């Protein structure tokens, strides 16, 4: 917290005196110790709510707790946005609303999460921050759809793109929410010197069902040291280092709040906007930009979204998916430029595309007046002759006058995008003795799908079972326990693997914590 | 009083020979000291009635009294209003009538402000003054209802607006009453030279039920120099500085009082609507006008008022609340244009409204004959796909021949308006030793309520009380002293802080006065 | 305030405009440039001075980088060899960055030219004064601009652009060869061929961009309008040329226009990427009509990447923090390395700076810690710092002038 905030810009926002007085920032969480000495001022009269105890006090979970472990990530989180003292947050001038969903052990229900939502929205709370989620890449979740509510109510709403490692499609829920600051993170330039560089574990997109571009933005989320509960009566206050996409969403929510001190008009979709608009794209150790969907947009920077008055929307636009087996195939969107400032300006576009057969074009200037809008209306034109298969990347680069004021990274997937075909798999004993229940997750339904039965010693057993033309979503199999047909298992322990096909490709994945015959 | 009256206009009416002579005022406060040399000849031989001591002598409360302090309150009013001599008042030729209903200390019971109201309806008072009220946000206030009862018995009502920090919905009691000119404080010009500026410490509507705009009109209300008793026997009158909502009422008690010399044929309302007709609009010192709720319609201008031959009635008109989830509501007024003149007129109207999604529209243009009556019908459609919720203020302008004959204030809310879910709370001992009695007012109820105790040092210790389902109005809840459940507090001093939830927000109030367990 | 002085200035009805003002940034689509091209669209002549910058491409200045107004270089008048018209030496030249438009538009006389000065002296606050500079050839243009409107009221602000440009006298130099068009734009102006024309040819000036091709043959082509103001049919004869090899030039070779009609000549260029040796070249389209020359419209190309200075402005302040140092410089188009080096009061290399890779186009802004070659410390004393910026094939430098301190 004395590092990475320096980096994103926040010191240099607080000597310009924006430090996020009088916004209200909530730390949906496992709860906030608001008795750290660096949190007890940012804590107003009503602390928050407990929802997994149903009472006023959102203290984290105590140590010794029958239905779980005690727990110390809200109050890190609550440190890295918003600390006054020791160590300073991100917005160490903002006051906190805590709201325990996840009970001990840090799991919480759905329900849980979106009430926790509802009554952040009730409470006033300007910018709202999630650090949890779970790994179903579903735009359509009941916690993103409850985000997307939010963020219409004038609510802000940042959220951790979730912690899986380097590999595409692996977002969490309710980080592929449509309107929300999904945050991945990154690691701060250290010495070969590298520079940032983005952390192995952060969640990669595009957006099942969507095709949209995830994380939004990045922030620093390795080695974050921050306020936490020991747990110790002998002295409960400390601070900790923790590592996790959940902790670059923090930054990004302290980076709201002071940009809602400063700008205070601007409404929550402005806000990611200029976030995204105004943010340092990251290369690698060899020198290679980082793919979009592993970056978002790049780094924050919080000064010089403090200091914009042009916004480009949406920060970041998908094309979908061209199907067309000949032919060519032609989509445009209309992105919109607002000019803040109180002079007419000009504004050049340069569009691009990697790839070939992808040919871009559209209005390549546009004229706003002064405290108006604009519309470029960029095209995108694919040649299914040429083109080979797969994920490309583009970009539209808006200048004006000198500076560039945004660069809006875009997407297309040609033919059948490659995600993977079975998310998870796991096996729970049946309702009858002697039998099993397998319940999968086909992100977009299969073609064909066989379950597969492994020893203890990974040596392939048989075959569960076979099943065709699957719906997409979650499914259920009842599975007697027997093996290839009437060839019943030894007694034992057993992997199973999920394979799917789906479209033309396929995918697997095998059960952890292997099931008991 | 010297610098005030001016600027409202009252010297330029005296000088039109319009002082005030022949009207009756009567002012409802602590008394008046009617021995000032510059109060004693606007006095008749009966000088008023005094409610807190039931005689004919409605002195102020002298110094060494039992049962409470020394005031000024009234006296100070009845020199701004008329006083003749050293200090002008604004219709310094005006009989009055002093009324005592607030006792020593400045506190008064309802029933003695009604007994007070309807005495000075009997006693012929033409204008009646109102520097009193509560901090109740209710229309149908006994106060309220009182008020109402005249201004339909041919007596004009002028009252405060009420002394609370800027914040919406914080209009007292008598000065939400439906039929009365409520009056806010501004800051006369002062030398980086501002224009005039409202006091931060009027109150400010809307009127709860009602959503009706208030103050009315507002008037020179800070540093208002005006007549007081020094209660020193050695030379018992003189002149003191006072600052207040409850002084901004008197400059235009006085205004109606002249008017009423002027035009004799007005009836309470048309004078109500003279004035709010012709007043000036406020900006603030960046430059943007005051909003509707903290203007009414701007600052008085008497000699506007006096040469009018046009009124348009209600001056002000809220349109209410638009609930409807999806599709277009449609309201509609009728406001009504007085062509007071002896030529035929042709008025033209201006309507608009702030905020996207509400269109406006309706009669743009009346032809009046001489001395006869039009009705305009103003007309609000708000799509509620595209309007975000909020408070919207609009206007309906209306011109005749050159010259502004009046700009209308009209203001709409959507979806659920952003009063304070919870105003007051209290904690008194209760009739049983050891026990509590927590008395709240929930203007529209509580969907949940909760009560929870801080200790001298704001920590919170504990959660007092939990009730769902609350009726609105004021709540009375036993607490017997225990936190939590079962858990006794320590003995101490404590302060108790409401929270209360109701459709879709939550407000919290604090008690000041901690009590002691 | 340029801005809002234009803005101003089209608000109370000025019919002409005159900005004798400029920074020496080579943008197309600055703000001054664009509230320019506001204007000459609501219904104002805009005129404006190139700018004051030694012999030398691409040093046209900000507002006369727009792409509709006049701009306005300055010449010398025939002093005694006897020598003719010539350009001085200071006016800005082009092209246009990121546009290639042929700048200055025109050229007029601004090289000691008297008029009225205030003295700035209580007992005679008025006199004249001498002075010099491409801001004092542009009133000239708005003067005749003035004049032309008056005596035709009904030409639009692009029409009187046109008239002035087309009935233009080229200048040669000393030794007798023409001036490069972006020395020139089109000649010095000439009011009274300009009053007296019946035929307009739109645009005066005409640029084709820049021609990147490999290999194999690259075409282009523009469409000119000739606006026949005279009462009688005419006909009207083009003729093409271009310098260098490998450039062939086509088009209409003939126009008849009716009276009080538009026609379109469609002239087109094609240039062999195996023949044509890399750079500027200048051509023309010239009109002729029953006799007279009615116009002679300045073209040009631009072959594989133009040789615009790669970096054009460094500046050197202290930073936020004492002792630090911000590096704020300006790139046209970007640039692939980016290097600045340090050098003593006596300009010998004293190491380098900072080295950059992959920047971005525009103005650019670099953090220094003031020590150079890594972790070596300056002494104290004054110091100058040099850009080198290399991009696509071409590299640039620009020496800080004003040392800062250490």
Redesign the interface.
């Known amino acids: 917290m004395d590092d990475s905030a320096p980096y994103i810009g926040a010191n ?1 926002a607080w000597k310009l005196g924006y430090t996020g007085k009088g916004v209200k920032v909530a730390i949906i969480d496992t709860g906030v110790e ?1 008795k750290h000495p660096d949190l007890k001022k940012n804590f107003g ?3 928050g709510y407990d929802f997994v105890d149903n ?3 959102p203290e984290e979970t105590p140590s010794g707790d029958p239905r779980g472990a005690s727990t110390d990530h809200g109050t890190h989180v609550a440190g890295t946005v918003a600390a006054n003292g020791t160590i300073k947050g991100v917005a160490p001038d903002a006051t906190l609303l805590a709201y325990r969903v996840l009970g001990p052990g840090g799991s919480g229900t759905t329900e849980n999460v979106i009430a926790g939502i509802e009554r952040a ?4 709370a300007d910018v709202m921050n999630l650090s949890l989620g779970n790994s179903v890449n579903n735009p359509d979740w009941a916690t993103s759809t409850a985000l997307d509510w939010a963020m219409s ?2 609510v802000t709403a940042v959220t951790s793109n979730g912690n899986s490692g380097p590999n595409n499609w692996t977002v969490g829920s309710p980080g592929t929410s449509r309107e929300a600051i999904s945050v991945g993170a990154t690691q701060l330039p250290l010495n070969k010197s590298l520079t940032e560089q983005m952390a192995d574990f952060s969640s990669r997109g595009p957006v099942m069902d969507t095709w949209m571009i995830k994380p939004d933005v990045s922030a620093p989320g390795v080695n974050i040291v921050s306020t936490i509960p020991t747990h110790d009566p002998a002295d409960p206050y400390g601070y900790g280092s923790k590592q996790g996409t959940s902790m670059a969403s923090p930054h990004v929510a302290g980076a709201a709040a002071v940009i809602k001190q400063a700008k205070p008009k601007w409404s929550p979709e402005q806000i990611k906007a200029a976030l995204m608009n105004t943010a340092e794209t990251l290369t690698d150790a060899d020198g290679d930009v980082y793919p979009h969907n592993a970056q978002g947009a790049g780094s924050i920077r919080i000064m010089k979204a403090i200091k914009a008055d042009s916004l480009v929307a949406p920060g970041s636009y998908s094309y979908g998916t061209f199907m067309k087996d000949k032919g060519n195939e032609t989509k445009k969107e209309t992105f919109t430029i607002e000019n803040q400032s109180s ?4 504004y ?1 576009l340069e569009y691009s595309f990697n790839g070939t057969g992808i040919t871009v074009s559209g209005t390549d ?1 546009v ?1 706003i007046p002064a405290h108006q809008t604009g519309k470029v209306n960029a095209k995108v034109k694919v040649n299914a002759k040429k083109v080979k298969a797969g994920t490309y990347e583009g970009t539209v680069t808006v ?6 004021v945004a660069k809006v990274p875009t997407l297309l997937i040609v033919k059948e995008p490659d995600y993977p075909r079975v998310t998870s798999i796991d096996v729970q004993d049946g309702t009858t003795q002697g039998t099993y229940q397998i319940e999968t997750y086909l992100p977009a339904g299969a073609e064909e799908l066989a379950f597969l039965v492994y020893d203890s010693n990974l040596d392939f057993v048989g075959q569960a079972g076979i099943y065709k033309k699957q719906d997409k979503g979650y499914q259920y199999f009842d599975w007697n326990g027997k093996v290839n047909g009437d060839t019943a298992l030894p007694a034992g322990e057993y992997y199973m693997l999920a394979y799917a096909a789906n479209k033309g490709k396929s995918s697997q994945v095998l059960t952890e914590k292997p099931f008991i015959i």
Chains 1, 2 share one sequence.
């Open positions: 240099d608001y009269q009503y602390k009472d006023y006090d929205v009730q409470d006033g109510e004038g002079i007419r300006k000009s050049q200037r004229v200048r004006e006058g000198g500076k560039t």
